[PDB]
């Protein structure tokens, strides 16, 4: 049988939320996602979800995220959006609430 193992996150933020000024400029990086495969697999990093990744762009060796839009608090205060971390073999997709803080 197949021997694997698929990775998870190891951010905190997964746990709490992720902090975001609405006074981010678009084109800033708002973090670096970050994961651990016991196997030592290669790793791909994403983001799933129409408005997700319309607001936000993920780097897919790096696990670097940048906002591809304006935030406004007015507007919209709070996303929830899904990132995913796969080894090929599995994929795993968590919620994060990302508050946008003024
Ligand atoms: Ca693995």
Redesign the pocket.
């Known amino acids: 049988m197949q021997v694997?193992?698929?990775?998870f996150f190891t951010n905190h933020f997964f746990d709490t939320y992720l902090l975001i000024s609405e006074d981010t400029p678009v084109g800033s990086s708002v973090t670096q996602l970050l994961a651990r495969?016991?196997?030592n697999?290669p790793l791909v990093f994403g983001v799933s979800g129409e408005e997700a990744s319309r607001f936000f762009a993920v780097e897919p060796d790096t696990g670097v995220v940048w906002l591809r839009q304006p935030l406004d608090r007015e507007t919209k205060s709070e996303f929830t959006v899904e990132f995913s971390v796969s080894?090929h073999?599995?994929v795993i997709t968590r919620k994060v609430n990302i508050q946008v803080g003024d």
Do not use: F, V
């Not at 694997?4 to 990775?7: E, G, K, S, T, Y």
């Open positions: 694997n193992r698929l990775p495969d016991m196997d697999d080894d073999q599995g």
